[PDB]
Design an enzyme around this catalytic site. Sequence first.
Site, PDB file in Angstrom:
ATOM      1  N   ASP A   1       0.777  -1.230  -0.044  1.00 56.96           N
ATOM      2  CA  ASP A   1       0.129   0.073  -0.070  1.00 56.96           C
ATOM      3  C   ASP A   1       0.929   1.307   0.155  1.00 56.96           C
ATOM      4  O   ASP A   1       0.330   2.207   0.578  1.00 56.96           O
ATOM      5  CB  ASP A   1      -0.926  -0.004   1.123  1.00 56.96           C
ATOM      6  CG  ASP A   1      -2.343   0.471   0.780  1.00 56.96           C
ATOM      7  OD1 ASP A   1      -2.570   1.427  -0.516  1.00 56.96           O
ATOM      8  OD2 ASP A   1      -3.059   0.834   1.689  1.00 56.96           O
TER       9      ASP A   1
ATOM     10  N   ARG B   1      -0.663   9.174   0.559  1.00 57.26           N
ATOM     11  CA  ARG B   1      -1.661   9.104   1.780  1.00 57.26           C
ATOM     12  C   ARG B   1      -1.053   8.315   3.000  1.00 57.26           C
ATOM     13  O   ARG B   1      -1.837   8.491   3.889  1.00 57.26           O
ATOM     14  CB  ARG B   1      -2.998   8.601   1.580  1.00 57.26           C
ATOM     15  CG  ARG B   1      -3.173   7.335   1.024  1.00 57.26           C
ATOM     16  CD  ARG B   1      -4.636   6.776   0.323  1.00 57.26           C
ATOM     17  NE  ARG B   1      -4.304   5.415  -0.174  1.00 57.26           N
ATOM     18  CZ  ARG B   1      -4.018   5.116  -1.426  1.00 57.26           C
ATOM     19  NH1 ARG B   1      -4.013   6.068  -2.271  1.00 57.26           N
ATOM     20  NH2 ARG B   1      -3.670   3.958  -1.711  1.00 57.26           N
ATOM     21  N   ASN B   2      -0.098   7.316   2.698  1.00 63.23           N
ATOM     22  CA  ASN B   2       0.162   6.099   3.669  1.00 63.23           C
ATOM     23  C   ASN B   2       1.564   6.681   4.110  1.00 63.23           C
ATOM     24  O   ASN B   2       2.385   5.806   4.464  1.00 63.23           O
ATOM     25  CB  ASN B   2       0.133   5.098   3.254  1.00 63.23           C
ATOM     26  CG  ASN B   2      -1.292   4.509   2.892  1.00 63.23           C
ATOM     27  OD1 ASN B   2      -2.240   5.084   3.426  1.00 63.23           O
ATOM     28  ND2 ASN B   2      -1.261   3.804   1.767  1.00 63.23           N
TER      29      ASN B   2
ATOM     30  N   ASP C   1       1.219   2.791   7.386  1.00 61.40           N
ATOM     31  CA  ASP C   1       0.109   1.986   7.304  1.00 61.40           C
ATOM     32  C   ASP C   1       0.575   0.474   6.644  1.00 61.40           C
ATOM     33  O   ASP C   1       0.630   0.286   5.357  1.00 61.40           O
ATOM     34  CB  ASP C   1      -0.908   2.440   6.206  1.00 61.40           C
ATOM     35  CG  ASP C   1      -2.339   2.291   6.191  1.00 61.40           C
ATOM     36  OD1 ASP C   1      -2.504   1.109   6.743  1.00 61.40           O
ATOM     37  OD2 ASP C   1      -3.319   2.877   5.953  1.00 61.40           O
TER      38      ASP C   1
HETATM   39  C1  1N1 Z   1      -4.203  10.892  10.950  1.00 61.35           C
HETATM   40  C2  1N1 Z   1      -3.108  11.689  11.421  1.00 61.35           C
HETATM   41  N1  1N1 Z   1      -1.991  11.008  12.096  1.00 61.35           N
HETATM   42  C3  1N1 Z   1      -0.836  11.778  12.597  1.00 61.35           C
HETATM   43  N2  1N1 Z   1       0.134  11.302  12.941  1.00 61.35           N
HETATM   44  C4  1N1 Z   1       0.282   9.932  13.286  1.00 61.35           C
HETATM   45  N3  1N1 Z   1       1.259   9.596  13.954  1.00 61.35           N
HETATM   46  C5  1N1 Z   1       1.592   7.879  13.853  1.00 61.35           C
HETATM   47  C6  1N1 Z   1       0.224   7.757  13.239  1.00 61.35           C
HETATM   48  C7  1N1 Z   1      -0.141   6.136  13.083  1.00 61.35           C
HETATM   49  O1  1N1 Z   1      -1.161   5.986  12.528  1.00 61.35           O
HETATM   50  N4  1N1 Z   1       0.542   5.078  13.529  1.00 61.35           N
HETATM   51  C8  1N1 Z   1       0.657   3.989  13.343  1.00 61.35           C
HETATM   52  C9  1N1 Z   1       0.971   3.271  11.918  1.00 61.35           C
HETATM   53  C10 1N1 Z   1       1.736   3.807  11.130  1.00 61.35           C
HETATM   54  C11 1N1 Z   1       0.457   1.782  11.848  1.00 61.35           C
HETATM   55  C12 1N1 Z   1      -0.052   1.137  12.920  1.00 61.35           C
HETATM   56  C13 1N1 Z   1      -0.774   1.685  14.059  1.00 61.35           C
HETATM   57  C14 1N1 Z   1      -0.301   3.230  14.180  1.00 61.35           C
HETATM   58 CL1  1N1 Z   1      -0.879   3.896  15.796  1.00 61.35          CL
HETATM   59  S1  1N1 Z   1      -0.858   8.716  12.771  1.00 61.35           S
HETATM   60  C15 1N1 Z   1      -0.850  13.120  12.446  1.00 61.35           C
HETATM   61  C16 1N1 Z   1      -2.019  13.853  11.879  1.00 61.35           C
HETATM   62  N5  1N1 Z   1      -2.436  15.295  11.870  1.00 61.35           N
HETATM   63  C17 1N1 Z   1      -3.527  15.884  12.167  1.00 61.35           C
HETATM   64  C18 1N1 Z   1      -3.579  16.891  11.369  1.00 61.35           C
HETATM   65  N6  1N1 Z   1      -2.701  17.898  11.471  1.00 61.35           N
HETATM   66  C19 1N1 Z   1      -2.401  18.543  10.236  1.00 61.35           C
HETATM   67  C20 1N1 Z   1      -1.475  19.750  10.589  1.00 61.35           C
HETATM   68  O2  1N1 Z   1      -0.302  19.605   9.839  1.00 61.35           O
HETATM   69  C21 1N1 Z   1      -1.423  17.444  12.143  1.00 61.35           C
HETATM   70  C22 1N1 Z   1      -1.482  16.069  12.882  1.00 61.35           C
HETATM   71  N7  1N1 Z   1      -3.278  13.111  11.310  1.00 61.35           N
END
Ligand code: 1N1
Length: 264
Positions: free
Chosen positions: A127, A131-132, A145
């Site tokens: 994937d 986006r990932n 992801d």
């Molecule tokens: C959806 C999202 N993720 C963010 N940070 C992440 N860090 C780690 C994440 C995560 O998915 N890890 C992980 C993986 C990779 C696999 C399995 C399990 C897990 Cl736990 S998601 C930041 C964010 N932003 C909101 C919008 N704002 C915009 C301003 O610039 C700033 C912040 N949005």
Amino acid sequence: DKWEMERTDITMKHKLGGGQYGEVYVGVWKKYSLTVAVKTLKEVEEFLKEAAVMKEIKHPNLVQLLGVCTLEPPFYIVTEYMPYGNLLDYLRECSREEVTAVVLLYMATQISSAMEYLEKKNFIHRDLAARNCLVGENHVVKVADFGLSRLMTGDTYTAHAGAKFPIKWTAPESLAYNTFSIKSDVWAFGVLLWEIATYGMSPYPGIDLSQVYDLLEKGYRMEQPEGCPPKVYELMRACWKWSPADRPSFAETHQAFETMFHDS
Ligand SMILES: Cc1nc(Nc2ncc(C(=O)Nc3c(C)cccc3Cl)s2)cc(N2CCN(CCO)CC2)n1
Ligand SMILES: [Zn+2]
């Protein structure tokens, strides 16, 4: 595993991304004043397959696992937190005076260095897309992801019949016969590079999904984005060779970007 944690070590602050499958939060690990990200689900071993793959991978450009909670629901995967979100929204919204060509190149070197690592471990990601990918400070980019990632036994993984994939990122042998391999990750990398070079355009813009395989089969490839150097385009073109053997390895991809990078 030895990666379990007590649920009560973390305070769930706010939600970041809900799912049809399950949701994602930012939280704090009280005991260290560290911000972490927390992924969760409800009404196991699928969600867990992602956990199992992240246990085994330790490369500064792959979002790092910090622990899990997987004896009782709700089940948690916990990782370091990337403050600036996914790479696609970061590109679409950034200052282009702040993200120059040279920053875009740096981002690609990072990604090719994570895939160089994963190719040697014989993992496929399945994937790759902008986006990932997740972004941090100093223009750190980390691949993420891993919910379709798999340790391959030989050189090909075949997904189940009935299984549907994002067409504009998926290699033709994967669309035709459902066969994935490191080389099909190579293809998607190609498509990721074009998303980067264009500051986050959609691939094949204005082309019907239904026409993509066929167009491909008759030779069509995306065009050089404006400002993208020839050699980067040729690299991205090599990623899209019709035959998977003809595409480069991630070692080679990494080698080509590190070299371009140091020459600027
Ligand atoms: C959806 C999202 N993720 C963010 N940070 C992440 N860090 C780690 C994440 C995560 O998915 N890890 C992980 C993986 C990779 C696999 C399995 C399990 C897990 Cl736990 S998601 C930041 C964010 N932003 C909101 C919008 N704002 C915009 C301003 O610039 C700033 C912040 N949005
Ligand atoms: Zn290398």
